Symmetry: D2
Subunit: 249 residues, 4 copies
């Protein structure tokens, strides 16, 4: 019987490459999504075409709120409903936009940025552990977390909290055989709304190849941390940044 | 004329020693509190006995919610109403209790992330918005043990990591306005009120420097340095005040 | 042809496991040794039995001295002589012992061994490795220490060398990236405990490890090395992977 | 009686600023120097005309060698000879220049100077400081805030400053029981090298978020003075960045 993984924000970009690569490794997958319904459903079809009954979709808003715990419990519950087990959780979903200190309500910006990047991962980790071989969690962190983008306070706080969670849950879940690690991209797939000139400005800064990471290169690191080659690894965060975080201003 | 500071959770313990030390240095002070009204008022009276009209109190719950932004705006406003200015913000208030992975979880999230992280972000926003030979700065009370966390304190540890993030992010963003943003990071200081001496001792014995916890006044000393003219080039720094505790392996 | 790797201190323990696992992945290997000749040759014998002329040995003291540059240039040249290429360098050799601040080697000898092996030799080997490609998956892996910020009592010099090694890892990652040479680290917590250590003291450390109350096997350390040199890590440089079972996360 | 401090590389720039501010705080000072004999004697002269018998100079090469231990032992002995005590050691002296990995002095010499001045000498001075020991004893190591975002082709210099972080933490741990605190001060850009042209100076100035300017030597000395003071009696193994946000700025 094949293991199963939840990947949050799996319909597009990095999360999709992660779900595809896990599926290629033999995992059954829950493709969580928020708005990208048609892409998620299309991805599940593609994966079910390759090996039937190996992929389902699962819709959830991961904004912070009083019902977020129920939503997170449901994501994990859906893996058991589909596959009777849940071996891997990948915390990938993330809101990302500026929140300047000096000038959507601030209430909403806090809920979305802290919710998706930190609180939902925490609640998913809780539900993962409570519902419980080679069990592990991978959190998508940020290699630039100590050299953050200007005016991205709330986002930076979320990713910083995600580091805290990675370490805290590694320590706490170790006695249950659950490993908790992170993969930290620098620049990978650049945001759709970012202009081409700004994209080339970031590309030029990467020491290794003057280019961004492909989604697949990020996924490769995830695959390593969930595999048998990482059985002793927990609380570790692997930068996949082409040296970007090493470059001074 | 005298600068003014806001200290959150200033009724007791570390917050109180910080408020007392800032006042002795010549600052007028907003003593913010949540439940400790009698202690906040007593401190205010003591300080006002030293120099008239130099201390006020301000009550607010710093738990995350829809009203939190308004409460934080109000805390900062109280300093302007009382003193006409606000030169220093000290984010000290903090909830601290275990949240094991395996009182509702949404309230734990609201309390632990609210007090330790979101409230400080909101207060920083409001502090800076109102400033848009002056030495403006913010001190965030962090945790020296943030990368070697207490077992089953994930939410608290997440709040404190977030606070490091804010410290760095706000330092970068507010530097053009000449607002410095720094942190003080205790290891073990004033231990929980009722903790047995045998348990207190277990922690004291781990501290390389003197086998004792930090006094609130020693934590306060580092805050005083960071708000002073001797730290005018220091921003985004987090000073550990831990007697070497974070350096000790398991 | 097959890629070629240099592993320093590869005769025993963690270096042996790294050299073995690299050999099993298809690398030809230079087994460097200082005092462990018998061990290095018997590993080469075992590897060459699997695939003929894929393993050679190379002797050198990695202590800091006026001749260290020459010895490091020769370790790297041994790879080019044997195999015609050098694709991977694993800086594994390490001296490890206490150097108390407050009180039969002299202190200047302790400096030469602890800083030489853990930091200077890695730097010189990195330099020679890079120069011999100055005129396709090139990388260096440095054996670091997960406990570097919570150091063993009275191990100042050792700890200085492992800190220096982090610096080397980052500086060389930055400088060599335009040459397509990646530079990373693997950081064990408690793996194979030293032969010198008493059994009760071994169990003391084993008990502190969150993940399974046991030390890392040498092969688990080697697994992270294999990952870092592989095509699955083509965008990774200046990274240091802890392989410590969560030990570094545990407070006093 | 007045406390006494050793400051390495104290003839000029940041080390001088540190020596001056410790002297203004009431310390007697040992002004260590290597080549800057004239400027060292001149500083000692200025300080002694402020208070008699409160400054001495001490010559020493801090390049790594088999004699370096005796040299460092003698620096410490010189403070006890002049002043009868040694309360503070400041590790300030530092060689700084490129060592490209891919292509002057020999590589042996570069290792000896860059690792010796930045790491080995601080280690041996710490050893001798501790061995020779109301009281407020401490050591301050001049580190680098850009240690994890290093200057291109400065491997050996960066290895040394990294090693200095290791020593700061290792010594803090080991000397705590003796009541000796060990901390660091990490500048980003302070006094730029005299060799650097004004255009490259401004380039570096422009990058600093706080004021678009380098730290003054006095601003560095302030943080040193705090760490040696009674306001820091619980602080050990801490490295204070004095960098105006420089290390926080992405590429
Ligand atoms: N791209 C890069 O260069 C970098 C990425 N990272 C991290 O790696 C991970 C993946 O990156 P990337 O693919 O760019 O991520 P994206 O920014 O593309 O976001 C991925 C998914 O997050 C989901 N999401 C956003 N808001 C919510 C919400 N409120 N509730 C539920 N889901 C939500 C969205 O799903 P939907 O489309 O279904 O609505 C989105 O597709 C993230 O954690 C990111 O922070 C870190 C550094 C750099
Ligand atoms: N003490 C130590 O050893 C350590 C302390 N620290 C940090 O140093 C700082 C001060 O420490 P310490 O004195 O122990 O702090 P305490 O735990 O004593 O808490 C300080 C004050 O926080 C306020 N507070 C708690 N919850 C709320 C809330 N929901 N809304 C508003 N205020 C609230 C309380 O005010 P009220 O009484 O008026 O209700 C409390 O008195 C904290 O940030 C702490 O995390 C870090 C490591 C160790
Ligand atoms: N073992 C563990 O738990 C931990 C290991 N590490 C790092 O992992 C790596 C491997 O660890 P481990 O296998 O225990 O290493 P060892 O301590 O067993 O040393 C490995 C080899 O280093 C070589 N060596 C020692 N001194 C010299 C010298 N002066 N010149 C040349 N070679 C020398 C020796 O070769 P020979 O026998 O041929 O003379 C020795 O066999 C090391 O870098 C270590 O620092 C980090 C943390 C923990
Ligand atoms: N300046 C800056 O922007 C930064 C400085 N720092 C650190 O702060 C500290 C002070 O900086 P700065 O004033 O610029 O230092 P300098 O570069 O001016 O060096 C200070 C002194 O180091 C001494 N020195 C050099 N080589 C030797 C040697 N072989 N033996 C003995 N002494 C030697 C020299 O003494 P003499 O003249 O007597 O021969 C020199 O005057 C240093 O540790 C530096 O690395 C860190 C980051 C940035
Ligand atoms: N959820 C997301 N997090 N980060 C994203 C893109 C990151 C990005 O655009 C840059 C990162 C560093 C310089 S630019 S999407
Ligand atoms: N808000 C608070 N944060 N930390 C507090 C007390 C710290 C404490 O008891 C210990 C911290 C680490 C070992 S014991 S109160
Ligand atoms: N060269 C070596 N480096 N580290 C070695 C053994 C590691 C070891 O015993 C411990 C390291 C940290 C706690 S115990 S050998
Ligand atoms: N001993 C010394 N160390 N650092 C010195 C000057 C540092 C310097 O010029 C810069 C550091 C980072 C950008 S420019 S002298």
């Amino acid at each position: 019987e094949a293991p199963a993984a939840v990947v949050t924000g799996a319909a597009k970009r990095i999360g999709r490459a992660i779900a595809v690569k896990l599926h290629q490794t033999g995992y059954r997958v829950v493709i969580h999504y928020h708005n990208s319904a048609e892409a998620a459903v299309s991805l599940a079809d593609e994966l079910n075409k390759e090996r039937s009954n190996t992929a389902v979709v699962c819709q959830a808003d991961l904004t912070n709120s009083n019902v977020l715990p129920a939503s997170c419990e449901e994501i994990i519950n859906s893996c058991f409903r589909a596959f009777g087990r849940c071996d891997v959780l990948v915390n990938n979903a993330s809101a990302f936009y500026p929140t300047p200190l000096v000038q959507k309500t601030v209430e909403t910006q806090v809920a979305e940025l802290i919710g998706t990047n930190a609180i939902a991962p925490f609640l998913l980790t809780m539900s993962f552990a409570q519902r419980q071989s080679n069990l592990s969690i991978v959190n998508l962190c940020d290699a630039m977390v100590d050299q953050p983008c200007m005016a991205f306070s709330l986002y930076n706080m979320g990713k910083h909290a995600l580091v805290g969670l990675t370490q805290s849950a590694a320590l706490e879940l170790a006695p249950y055989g659950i490993r908790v690690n992170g993969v930290a991209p620098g620049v990978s797939l650049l945001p759709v709304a970012m202009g081409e000139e700004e994209k080339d400005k970031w590309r030029r800064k990467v020491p290794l190849g003057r280019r961004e990471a492909s989604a697949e290169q990020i996924a490769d690191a995830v695959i390593f941390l969930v595999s048998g080659s990482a059985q002793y690894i927990t609380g570790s965060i692997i930068k996949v940044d082409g040296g970007l975080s090493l470059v001074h201003a």
